[PDB]
Design a protein around this ligand. Sequence first.
Ligand SMILES: [Cl-]
Ligand SMILES: [Cl-]
Length: 233
Amino acid sequence: GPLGSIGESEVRALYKAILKFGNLKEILDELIADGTLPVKSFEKYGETYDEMMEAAKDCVHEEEKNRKEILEKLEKHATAYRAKLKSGEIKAENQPKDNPLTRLSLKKREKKAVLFNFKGVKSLNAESLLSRVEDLKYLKNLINSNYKDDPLKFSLGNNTPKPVQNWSSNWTKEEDEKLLIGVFKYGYGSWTQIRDDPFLGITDKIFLKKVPGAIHLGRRVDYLLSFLRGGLN
Ligand SMILES: [Cl-]
Ligand SMILES: [Cl-]
């Protein structure tokens, strides 16, 4: 390791490449060749990757543990209040504006960010890193298990996605299949290469006042991989 250690600028660079390609330990040679990362030994980059994903896991487990203990308390207070309504001591058509049922609902619906600091770099998002790595590992294994000879034959079967009939172009189950084959080939966020691939045939259906643009495609991929893995339940 005579080329020096890993610093803040190399960290910022590793974080962006993971959000795009997932687990990147098998493509280190390619990321150095085009200047994305400066030259260090392969071992140093692998060890840093592992350390980052470990800090992300710990962060996510710690916050779930706290949320769960608070929800257990509010559920207990809510049970007591129900016996009061059924018996008449409080009246259902005349409840106080601040009550045990509104307190439970607020926490249940709460959406807050889960963040950590790494090697001088501040405010990395633990949930974004973990979801992206697991979603892209699922997509690679599904396609190699079933369509090894020719990825272009990939199909959704009877699994039925929510329609987008208000887009500018005509977008159906077949266009959803070609979009996921494109991410398997080129990475998350590579929308120009996906649009211009002549074999996928969606060149005229993407708009880089026209919808879909870059923001709509990102949201569509996050929804489709969550749904196939059973995450809507
Ligand atoms: Cl080195
Ligand atoms: Cl691209």
